[PDB]
Symmetry: C2
């Protein structure tokens, strides 16, 4: 089968074959037929009595592990641990952001750039703002956010966009969230040998844990990032590997933590570093981003996006990356080995993400700007080691428009508001187009790449099908970057791919049919948007014609995201089967019984066209339930 | 191979074969040859690009996972997740204890029974005590303990017995602990795909996480349990399955959390329940404990111990267990199936541990005594369903002495203190016998059973070898219960098994050669003891001739325990190989490089006699280093 639908990706794969280096596709081929027990989730290693593998087919073979655990128990515990790991990644990101907020000052490297957003957040956290210094408010807000992570007494703080009905449903179900780290610890405790051996209770614990990601960790990370670095607005950028410059220093920012990439962007305008780039024979400094850190700097500053997850290696294969600076998460360790075949300096910066044989330059949060400057200086000085005979940058780049935060979307919707009617600054125009049926619904396309799927194929096919069916699409993460590379993040795309209702809406509001809402933590924005719509219509989020899709997901973070999206009341389609087919009870809970609990459920569909059809049918069913 | 060295265990295995019921041994046999990849730790399932298996033999076969992770990376992440799971189990136990402390009242079900212990703990937590109400002090202490779990700013609180040198070494190494749930979340975050791919850093993160178990979670759980339920003192009890009564109601308490078992013990003396037991035709109520909850109620009240981990099923096989009340952890789910073959009521009580097809009676912490009375009444009423023709109780039980908390040990040591010299109430006599060489050292024997080892064989052989070599032995958990069943927890055992120096010490102090220090969380007591000795000698804990042994461990909790014991500076022998042989770098870190970091290291030895020899040699070389 084809490795990708992206032509630049294919050219660089040919180059990597010529250079004798191996990619993620080569390692996937080397893995051959993957273990059936692990693929079905019926393998357990939770204690040293094991490893235990039970039959994925009930009634045949070994039925129980040594402790007596059934296939359903093993599957449910494995699924819960995936959710806990994803929640941990997102919560650690949000915790770093909250600590950065706590360390803001007027004359420091980290300031408050959006005071209005900070005051609204302070209102949401019961922090007084009138007649107060802005940094005192910021510190109080950071304290409340940090308490959300580890409070042992009392209730956590949740955003006002979350409907009261959803909160009450969670409380009745027993999944109402506690402090984030406490829920992660609870999930890890209940999967220990000889604890929870009941699939339904295990799934409910995992949902409870995922809620602390969706509504607390990711939400606080996003809102505090907006406070410190600015709320995203409509902004132009370029996407795909063609953004690399042969005649300039190329600095590629990979990872998820935004403070480092923000400081690197600021350092790139330093006169001394620009002069140094000129002195090593380069035209200038060309910052490019990848994955979620690329999404953040692109949403807030228009930094060009070099590529998504499965392109990271190919970025090095060009031979033009002088410095690859990585913080945490979704950083293929093979990059270190790959960097030996080129001049590239592979720089790790976080104590959480040491990588063997990489150059470690710890990013100092006490002096973020100076630390970013020294890291960037190492990248710039590496330009002298460039071998221009090994350089091949495909001439394939695509224009994209992004920056669609909830605030930006509301500002855009204000155009189609009659002044004599109003109100202004609400999601009411979006609610109106959804209720009238001009738009059939809204769908979030999120997730990673996965060698099991032709890279970016499922993302593009799902998005095109949805917008052709007058479903407005919001995108995050690597799916958003696939849309950017393909050319869907363009106003012209409305008349090229969208159906009649969505084309009319795009023309009236002057937006692309596909709205890039940011990184994987920025999925919280999607929740926020949906919540607002629900609160405007006086219904729960499970009554709306909305859906989420993860066509090509790979990470534990994706599992946690899908779990909290379903738990919030939004049906989720998974384009890659999770390792649960071995447990019939777990499959039945996730795809059938979940609808009785939270009004939504998982859909597993590896065919994107069938997924689009199912999404449209489900949205029409919910519309008929709602009367619209 | 023999299944056990215990004769009562063998008789009940014959009965289980005659009854056509499966045991843990039968399921272990059914599992046959366990997966080599999982056994070596070279299998990874951390993302849905996998499952990935790399060769346990370097230089052959597949070398890297799909993301590029090496065998060392996969092994180190798997080990770190085991540590995180064990830390989560212990920390959740301690968190429940702290919450119970927070709800103590003068006229409530949960009171303060050891005010002196509470005042000393309050001193350790910087809580004022002079001229204050005892329950105000208790609530402040509980608040400080709870803050240890989830504080995001500042430093955690550690017991005064921990040497300053050990803390400084931890700070220099980068493993100084943070809040417990924060460290669990950090480990889970760094094992996520594309985060940490460096074995040394991964092992250091796991050590940092395990410290929050050893010195914060388990320590606080133990000390708060002492405050609420009484400090253990020397007390007599009986051990092994013979403690069951044919003519009495048999109520078996299995699990770890002590509040439920304490309330059940209190409810058993209720006049209405005793009258009900008489009216259902029984002579009375016979409470028996298993595993750690049995250890707690036995340490504090002399409740008879029915058996350790791999005996739990056999307790039901007798046909005499009218009620089996379980809370969390090390509860084989197969019990639910097994109790169908008998009249036994298998009662789950904790929302953390639901077991399918068991009778769920949620233990209400708000009204603990009434809830315990209701559960106990269900067990008593089940006596009418006893089938006395199916009853077979082995006439095999053994006298044991336990209750050796640090306070009790100090009280015993006061006997050999010359009044004209002093001081009293210190560990000084123990330090003196260790320094003089009358005792060669002290060894902690802890851990579970494991079907991979003849049950209780390794525990007994290791303990007998150590005490024969004049090494005083402290025991916890299932190892302590194996010693109890065998008969080592007896004063007579001193003249039957101990060497000359240990026999003299036992005669002078009037103690058994093997000291039962309580449950698995009570391993913190061992730490406390060692710390005191170190603080009395002005040395670090790694300079002492001390060791820990886990001859037959199975649980993730055991992994976390061994990790924090080694990190504290105490060499640890493992009688069951952990899944790390696939990663040569991880093996080298755990067994060789750890000594450079923390002055102690792991020893993997499956032969108990060889383990005793190695322990004696290591203790002698540490003595020669210390000059004693
Ligand atoms: S999933 Fe289990 S059975 Fe399959 S290779 Fe991995 S450890 Fe072995
Ligand atoms: S927890 Fe149970 S099923 Fe899992 S490895 Fe241990 S004995 Fe086997
Ligand atoms: S994290 Fe890497 S090694 Fe582990 S399953 Fe995913 S791709 Fe394979």
């Amino acid at each position: 089968k084809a490795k990708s639908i992206d032509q630049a990706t294919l050219q660089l794969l040919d180059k990597a074959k010529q250079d004798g280096v191996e990619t993620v596709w080569d390692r996937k081929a080397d893995m051959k037929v993957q273990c059936g027990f692990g693929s079905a989730g019926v393998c357990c290693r939770n204690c040293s009595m094991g490893p235990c593998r039970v039959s994925p087919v009930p009634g045949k073979g070994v039925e129980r592990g040594i402790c007596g655990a059934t296939a359903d128990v093993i599957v449910s515990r494995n699924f819960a641990r995936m959710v806990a790991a994803g929640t941990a990644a997102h919560s650690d990101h949000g915790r770093s952001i909250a600590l950065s907020l706590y360390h803001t000052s007027k004359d420091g490297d980290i300031k408050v750039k959006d005071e209005n957003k900070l005051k609204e957040v302070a209102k949401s956290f019961n922090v007084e703002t009138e007649g107060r210094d802005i940094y005192d408010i910021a510190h109080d807000v950071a304290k409340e956010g940090l308490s959300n992570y580890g409070k042992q007494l009392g209730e956590v703080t949740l955003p006002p966009s979350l409907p009261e009905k959803r909160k009450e449903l969670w409380r009745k179900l027993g999944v109402y969230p506690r402090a984030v780290d406490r829920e992660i610890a609870a999930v890890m405790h209940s999967t220990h040998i000889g604890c929870n051996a009941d699939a339904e209770a295990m799934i409910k614990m995992s949902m409870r844990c995922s809620l602390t990601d969706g509504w607390m960790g990711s939400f606080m990370g996003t809102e505090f990032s907006d406070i410190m670095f600015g709320t995203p607005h409509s902004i132009d950028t370029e996407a795909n590997l063609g953004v690399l410059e042969k005649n300039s220093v190329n600095v590629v920012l990979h990872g998820h933590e935004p403070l480092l990439s923000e400081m690197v962007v600021e350092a790139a305008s330093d006169p001394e570093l620009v002069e140094l780039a000129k002195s090593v024979g380069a035209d200038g400094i060309n910052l490019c981003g990848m994955c979620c850190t690329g999404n953040e700097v692109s949403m807030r500053h228009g930094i060009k996006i070099a590529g998504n997850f499965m392109q990271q290696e190919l970025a090095v294969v060009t031979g033009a990356v002088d410095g690859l600076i990585v913080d945490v998460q979704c950083i293929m360790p093979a990059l270190a080995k790959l960097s030996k075949s080129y001049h590239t300096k592979f720089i790790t910066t976080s104590p959480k993400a040491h990588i063997t044989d990489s150059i470690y330059m710890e990013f100092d949060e006490e002096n973020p700007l100076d630390s970013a400057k020294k890291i960037l200086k190492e990248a710039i000085l590496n330009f002298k080691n460039r071998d221009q005979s090994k350089v091949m940058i495909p001439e394939l780049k695509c224009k994209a428009i992004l920056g669609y935060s909830v605030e930006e979307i509301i500002n855009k919707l204000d155009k189609v508001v009659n002044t004599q009617i109003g109100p202004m600054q609400t999601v009411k125009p979006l609610a109106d187009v959804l209720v009238s049926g001009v738009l059939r619904g809204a769908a979030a396309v999120v997730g990673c790449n996965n060698p099991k799927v032709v890279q970016d194929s499922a993302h593009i096919e799902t998005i095109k099908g949805l917008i052709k069916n007058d479903v407005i699409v919001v995108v995050t993460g690597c799916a958003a970057q696939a849309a950017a590379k393909y050319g869907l993040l363009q106003k012209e795309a409305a008349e090229k791919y969208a159906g009649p209702g969505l084309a009319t809406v795009c023309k009236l509001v002057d937006i692309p049919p596909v709205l890039h809402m940011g990184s994987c933590v920025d999925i919280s924005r999607i929740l926020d948007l949906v919540g607002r719509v629900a609160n405007l219509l006086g219904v729960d989020m499970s009554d709306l014609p909305v859906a989420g899709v993860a066509p090509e997901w790979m990470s534990e973070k994706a599992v946690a995201i899908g779990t909290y999206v379903v738990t919030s009341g939004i049906d989720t389609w998974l384009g890659v089967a999770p390792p649960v087919t071995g447990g019939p009870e777990v499959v039945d809970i996730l795809t059938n019984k979940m609808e009785d609990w939270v009004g939504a459920k998982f859909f597993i569909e590896t065919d994107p066209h069938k997924a689009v059809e199912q999404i449209v049918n489900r949205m029409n069913e919910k519309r008929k339930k709602l009367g619209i």
